[PDB]
Paper text:
These subunits remain associated and oligomerize with other protomers to form the functional prefusion conformation of Env, which is composed of a trimer of gp120/gp41 heterodimers. The N-terminal gp120 subunit is responsible for mediating binding to both the CD4 receptor and CCR5/CXCR4 coreceptor, while the gp41 subunit contains the hydrophobic fusion peptide and the helical heptad repeats that drive membrane fusion. However, Env has evolved to be metastable in this prefusion conformation, such that it is primed to rapidly and irreversibly transition to the postfusion conformation.
Based on structural analysis of both the prefusion and postfusion conformations of gp41, nine positions were selected to disfavor the formation of the elongated alpha helices, which are characteristic of class I fusion proteins in the postfusion state. These substitutions were then made in the CH848 10.17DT Env, a clade C Env that has been modified to engage the unmutated common ancestor (UCA) from the DH270 V3 glycan bNAb lineage. Therefore, the double mutant at positions 568 and 569, which yielded well-folded trimers as evaluated by negative-stain electron microscopy (EM), was selected for subsequent characterization, and these mutations were termed “2P” to reflect their similarity to the two consecutive proline mutations, which have been shown to stabilize betacoronavirus spike proteins in the prefusion conformation. To further validate that the newly introduced 2P mutations did not disrupt the overall folding of the gp41 subunit, we determined the cryo-EM structure of the CH848 10.17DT DS-SOSIP-2P Env to a resolution of 3.7 Å.
Numbering used by the authors:
A (entry chain B), B (entry chain C), C (entry chain A): 32 to 58, 67 to 139, 148 to 309, 312 to 321, 321A, 322 to 358, 360 to 398, 412 to 457, ...
Write the structure that this text describes.
């Protein structure tokens, strides 16, 4: 009996939101403009009893990271040489070392501009066949063109830059938090238990590949299979492996590099000669460990189609960029044929080798970015990588069999695989509750699942952490919004007569039309975000009573001071 | 007797200022780069008894909007193709369809670059005569040049962009307001009554035209005639109409469009062939409604030159861009001859047709911006528009007659015609007043014309609204200044011992050397901005007394606490 | 006995820091983009008894100013014409007027592009010999090239821009200050007395020269000799003069200027013809005033090598940019030979003339910036300048003699010479001290060397001044950090129960484990920054006691209000 409303600040309570996360680096493109070096030391905290719903296929971190990478790794071409003076009538013949012919390359000859513009030099380069296009149908002829020269002018990548994926961390600006699921076999969506808060993510490697996920974070106890709706054939399946399989890939033949003058100051790097022995670019996977993996995926894949047998087949065919395994290695771009790898059947109970083609002229993502020329790297090249996961699609011609095929290249699905466990939220530090009072007239959100009385002992902790080119403007935009939110909070607390105090008591009587729970049933038996959810719809009524009450009270005081 | 100073916060009082307004859009160039989509719902409030002076010919909104439009609609050319490879020796002959010769166009032939640089293609386009210049005086010859190729390299407008005027709203940042005159026949300057405040303007269409104002907001009850000083012949007269007259304009002949290759990726759009019948580009106005309008302007124009007769004549002659009616329609640029329209006399008590020329190479405003090539639009084109107003100038050769002529093209005068009714002001929420107290030891400005005691009941309303490329930077710079102003306010209230409270009372005695009015004569019979105007010169004395008093008081308290 | 901790705000105390100072201008490149016009009126204040250590060879103002100048005066080339169409096979012969041959210049002829691209014009210019390079070794021949056309494409400086050094002021953002040494013969490093604070520096002229410092601020009473370590031969010596010597320099021959068409809109300015008489570019210094200066430097230079004789010799030889006196005059760039000037010996007790070469193609600083073409200025040119100081280096071949030579061109050393007297600091307005109290339950830093009790009478002064492309972003970044620092201060004062008050008293008892000094020995006999230095290591203990105490106190009050 005789309840009145009280206002609290620094309540551990939150709402679902979207806002620009800042890029954080340990200790090249990322750590030289978009990402601040900031050595984010691990600072996780477990939340005792909270439950949240998480959803991989709506997490705005993936679409933020896609825009961040696309923008950054288009902007990193801006200082470098345009190959516009190289769109020249290109005359070509078969490439040959004294040791043999190379079928993957042509030998081409052209005219180039010097820093003395009025003279032109006859010059030659070897080019990989998939970047050269024939210039007329009229006769079988030696005359060719660079493939980009009907669509875009390409930029060479400056040889100081390197594409090796550095680990990237994402972090919350002040007044926001990241929540993380620890639960085994989370299935990418639905109700989760054992949540933690972390001020930043673990390292996400910005690795780009089309059918096999290379160097990703491993699965924790058993194979996890994820998609929006397994019944719908139009949705990608992400498969996340527990025990790795290791892929070794190489260009086995030694290429020499030459520099061509191409006007004032600018220079073009191209393949000059091949040193000795010749063999095609290739990769190996250990056949038994692949078989075991393909089987162990199989028995988890069966549980969603229980009575049907399952079998694996080639990708959809056509253009290399979808029907093949793409990746970057040493700075060269490899495309490999996977027909040997995805070939088998399952119902119960040596090395395989892949062969590849190399390209230099590449369209980085889905026609959104500039055409890049990848400059050649000298000598032999090798990469070691871990296959962490598979991207699959499911085809009826049959009732007893399901048929699965490699697919990918909506680049978001690679970054979704590292970000399945994460959610972004906004802290809302104000709240109101009933109490028996009259006015006289351990970490960022740490308590959040607890009894409301316990959280009232730690209010200061959620109070302090409220305050602290695109890459510049978004930091200033984030910081100013964080300041403006804090000032609105303190201004309401001024207008209600609390005037900078964390727990505050007021003459507005509680109304049973809002809630009827006992004082102990509120204070001992409920957790703050549940109380907030219940009072939510009435909340905008309460603030009007507080403002008029303070205005009445100040007029009564201002009157009395003339007679006191 | 026994008055002391009191400090108030959220007083409805203001000063005249300039500060960059933010561009707002309903729901192409404006709403996709400079202007935020923000669907500004109408939120006007009338002010009861305030009077202000307004002045059209010094309103810094017009010069802000001019810079905003010039900057934006120069920046919208930045991504598009440069026609530098088109400055070529251009060889030309008369244009002819089997149906006849076209006198407005030449047929020109030239050499163009392909994405294969080492070959050149012979190619042709039709060009409108006013964009082509003859290349030597030596003989009457077929050799010509594009007009821009001695001054600037032109950029084509990208065909995704469209020039149709979307309505633009201007809004006040926090701590500022817009005031509006409702008064009929305001005459553009002087003392106004019935003012309103509005958080944003109505829609201003950014329409560009040189002699007749198209699609502007109409006059409310009778024809309004505006200028700085009607006696001075050197000043433009704006005339604002009550009942519209409707203009229909067309290109009646069907033009086919062709795309020319112009190096890698880039393409040029030009007129290829004309389909059939040929007739000159023309406009119509209904002759009786024009006559009635020209007469009804006449009887209001007489009242400033009472005894003299008035007559209308051609523009000043010379170059098309001043001596003709320019406008844009469907994306083509029309220039029309107005000699038929401004021809008549007045002393008391069918369609007219105009004929036109089309240009593609245009200098958008007074040599300030890039040269734009307007790409041709296929088929026949028509526009319907309302003539809202006239721009005039007055020529002595006579005593009985005044002679009036069309003039314009200082682009500000079109935007002045939509912004005549508006003023920008800064809220100054602090103030001091006398009271009988000792210290113990409905909308954004809504009340502003009222008795001071009444405004003291609504102080919170003026308190809350104090807080909330160039297009990015100017919003951060506006927001940070709004935060810094608020913090200075709260810091003074700290230094004076009010420490976050809206009405505050102090031991500094009022001094008759500042003012001598009775307590009721202050509090009942005056309005806040008048009291502020009166106390203005003394105000900087008062703040020194407040600061030293608080410092004395705190030392006295800090002493006593050792003995309390 | 019975001491308790008290918190103060606006304490005059500071720490050593770096933060980006803002450029300010009196009343062209500086005052039109990087530098605000703000006519910064002199506002120095002397500090009574403070001492600080200053160090010229670690002052981050010099490295900030270097980055500011390099960035600005590279960015000022961005709008102007690229000379890429001028890298042409250039055919040349000896230059001759009817009056004679000029040995410093060639006459060169070339082909240029018109705004009509398909025609080329035969055209000629005179060029200064040091900017032209011979194109093949095969024979002694008339064929040449512009020197930049193997490294960079140069930009012409737009003739509206001017390089005359305007005085630049550097100023502190809110929450920072600049401190200044007034002491005579400061020796560039170590403990200083008679310090002042000033909100901005005096005018620093951004003058660039390589061996003699022109137009710098003079020495105040006697010659000052400065370096990190005079024993180390690898360190530059700065010598700062008391009485000036005046240098007059000229190009005595009249050059006519011609404008060449170089594609659409763009134009190139070059030397056309020489009017009449011919004589080499030269400078004069008065021989007796130089001798006296070189001697008077000598007797101060002896005091660091007491028994040795001292003698002066030529610079190191090789490339002009280090081995010669560079400067800019009227917009031309002069390089002069100093062998006549630095030639003499000292042990105890007419005009000299220098001859020069002119260049147009210049690399502004150490290969960091673009290559600039300096356009020719018409007519004869003269400059008057004051030699303010010398840059020297010391070479063993001997025991009785020290040998000194001109050196420079690490551009920082010119700006170090104007900034030797300055230091940047951060105000830290919080502090804690002991007092006998229980809780009931003249300028920017002006006092800073005084007794702590006296500073407590002026706390408000240090309180108010806490609050108020790269050139835009750095001002927003600075302002937002200044706001965020202030909000953190006020938030701690909230969490400790002071809630916006300048002197505040608390129930936390003082602990002898921190300090043991008498109450008067603290309050009367010590100055705030010394007390701050002493309490420094314990300080982070104190804030934990304050936060838990306030939380205890608020819970005790919130309990009692139910029973009051
Ligand atoms: C690619 O083509 C070039 C041009 O024909 C080859 O270079 C020539 O090689 C022969 C070898 O006997 C020499 O005699 C010529 O003097 C070379 N010409 C030049 C311009 O250097 C080159 O060997 C070919 N490379 C491959 C791998 O096919
Ligand atoms: C998941 O996919 C299934 C189909 O794969 C959706 O259910 C229906 O399936 C039948 C048979 O293919 C169709 O005729 C219906 O049109 C489908 N309904 C819809 C709305 O598509 C099912 O809806 C999907 N799940 C969700 C959450 O929409
Ligand atoms: C003063 O201006 C107000 C607008 O603030 C006018 O209000 C309009 O009045 C008419 C009837 O006369 C209504 O139909 C409108 O809906 C009103 N509102 C608006 C926004 O137009 C008012 O008439 C004016 N009064 C005087 C005496 O000038
Ligand atoms: C503009 O000039 C071009 C070039 O002369 C004309 O195109 C030619 O038209 C004749 C019609 O008999 C054809 O025989 C030629 O083969 C065309 N030449 C090309 C290159 O296509 C064009 O018809 C002229 N158009 C107008 C409207 O004058
Ligand atoms: C408005 O214009 C008139 C003239 O049109 C200005 O008054 C004077 O007019 C006579 C006769 O033309 C001139 O000899 C004077 O030199 C004019 N005076 C000035 C100061 O120009 C009148 O001043 C103008 N109004 C204002 C506000 O200046
Ligand atoms: C300490 O430095 C101050 C400057 O802060 C010196 O003040 C100058 O003193 C002379 C007379 O000696 C005056 O003419 C100047 O006007 C003073 N002000 C300035 C800005 O120069 C002061 O002399 C120094 N005192 C000592 C003992 O070093
Ligand atoms: C630089 O060279 C040009 C080109 O030879 C000289 O210009 C010629 O001067 C003679 C003087 O008798 C004239 O007959 C020619 O008609 C000029 N040619 C042109 C293209 O104008 C120029 O005089 C030389 N200048 C110097 C100072 O050496
Ligand atoms: C200042 O320079 C001197 C040498 O010019 C440094 O002292 C030592 O000098 C001897 C003889 O040249 C060398 O063998 C030593 O190696 C020098 N020591 C070092 C650490 O370089 C002296 O150290 C320099 N001053 C400072 C502050 O380092
Ligand atoms: C797991 O994934 C499947 C995909 O078809 C989905 O239908 C299901 O709702 C998810 N959650 C659980 C708890 O099974
Ligand atoms: C390899 O795995 C596939 C897929 O289950 C299976 O068809 C095949 O029999 C396995 N073993 C061998 C030796 O290929
Ligand atoms: C309590 O709530 C009801 C329903 O909203 C309302 O009618 C009543 O006025 C409220 N009580 C008070 C004291 O206003
Ligand atoms: C109206 O406009 C005329 C223009 O000549 C001006 O002189 C006058 O001051 C304005 N105001 C009034 C109330 O007439
Ligand atoms: C049209 O208006 C003008 C201007 O007053 C007048 O001279 C003319 O007589 C009017 N009537 C006709 C039929 O032109
Ligand atoms: C009142 O005003 C006069 C004139 O400014 C001044 O001399 C006097 O000191 C003021 N009164 C007090 C109490 O200071
Ligand atoms: C003065 O400069 C010399 C340079 O060798 C340096 O060693 C010395 O420490 C400086 N300071 C003093 C007070 O001499
Ligand atoms: C000039 O100064 C130098 C340096 O001390 C000295 O050698 C010479 O004797 C002086 N006098 C003359 C006349 O050169
Ligand atoms: C005083 O300081 C000592 C040493 O840090 C500490 O053990 C003691 O607990 C402190 N006193 C109080 C009252 O906490």
């Amino acid at each position: 009996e005789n309840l009145w409303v009280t206002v609290y600040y620094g309540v551990p309570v939150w709402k679902e939101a979207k806002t620009t996360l800042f890029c954080a680096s340990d200790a090249n493109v990322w750590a030289t403009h978009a990402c601040v070096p900031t050595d984010p030391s691990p600072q996780e905290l477990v939340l005792g009893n909270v439950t949240e719903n998480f959803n991989m296929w709506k997490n705005d971190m993936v679409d933020q990271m896609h825009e961040d990478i696309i923008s950054l790794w288009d902007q990193s071409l801006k200082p470098c040489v345009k190959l516009t003076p190289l769109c020249v009538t290109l005359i070509c013949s078969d490439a040959t070392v004294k040791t043999g012919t190379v079928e993957e390359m042509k030998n081409c000859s052209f005219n180039t501009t010097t820093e003395i513009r009025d003279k032109e030099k006859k010059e030659y380069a070897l080019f990989y066949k998939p970047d050269i296009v024939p210039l007329s149908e009229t006769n079988n002829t030696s005359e060719y063109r660079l493939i980009n020269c009907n669509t875009s002018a390409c930029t060479q990548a400056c040889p100081k830059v390197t594409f090796e994926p550095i680990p990237i961390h994402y972090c919350a600006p002040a007044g926001y938090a990241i929540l993380k699921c620890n639960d085994e076999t989370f299935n990418g969506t639905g109700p989760c238990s054992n949540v933690s808060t972390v001020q930043c993510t673990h390292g996400i490697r910005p690795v780009v590949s089309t059918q096999l996920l290379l160097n990703g974070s491993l699965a924790e106890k058993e194979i996890v299979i994820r998609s929006e709706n397994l019944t719908n054939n139009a949705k990608i399946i992400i498969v996340h492996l527990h025990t790795p399989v290791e892929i070794v890939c190489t260009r086995p033949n030694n290429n020499t590099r030459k520099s061509v003058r191409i006007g004032p100051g600018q220079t073009f790097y191209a393949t000059g000669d091949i040193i000795g022995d010749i063999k095609q670019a290739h990769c190996n996977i250990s056949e038994e460990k692949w078989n075991d993996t393909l089987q162990k995926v199989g028995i988890e894949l069966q549980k969603h189609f229980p009575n049907k047998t399952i079998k694996y087949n080639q990708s959809a065919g056509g253009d290399m960029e979808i029907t093949t395994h793409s990746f970057n290695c040493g700075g060269e771009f490899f495309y490999c044929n996977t027909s040997n790898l995805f070939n088998g059947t399952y119902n119960g109970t040596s090395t395989i080798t892949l062969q590849c083609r190399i390209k230099q002229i590449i369209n980085m993502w889905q026609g959104v970015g500039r055409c890049m020329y990848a400059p050649p790297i000298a000598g032999n090249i090798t990469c070691r990588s871990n296959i962490t996961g598979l991207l699959l699609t499911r085809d009826t011609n049959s009732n007893e069999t399901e048929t699965f095929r490699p697919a990918g290249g909506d680049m978001r699905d690679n970054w979704r695989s590292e970000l399945y466990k994460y959610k972004v939220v906004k802290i809302e530090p104000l709240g109101v509750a009933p109490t028996r009072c009259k006015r006289r007239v351990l970490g960022f959100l740490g308590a959040a699942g607890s009894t409301m009385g316990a959280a009232s002992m730690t209010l200061t902790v959620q109070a302090r952490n409220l305050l602290s080119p695109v890459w510049g403007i978004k930091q200033l935009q984030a910081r100013v919004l964080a300041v403006e939110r804090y000032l609105r909070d303190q201004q309401l607390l001024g207008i209600w007569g609390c005037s900078g105090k964390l727990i505050c008591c007021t003459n507005v009587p509680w109304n049973s039309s809002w809630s009827n729970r006992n004082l102990s049933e509120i204070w001992d038996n409920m957790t703050w975000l549940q109380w907030d959810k219940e009072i939510s719809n009435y909340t905008q009524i309460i603030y009007g009573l507080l403002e008029e009450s303070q205005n009445q009270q100040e007029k009564n005081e201002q009157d009395l001071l003339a007679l006191d």
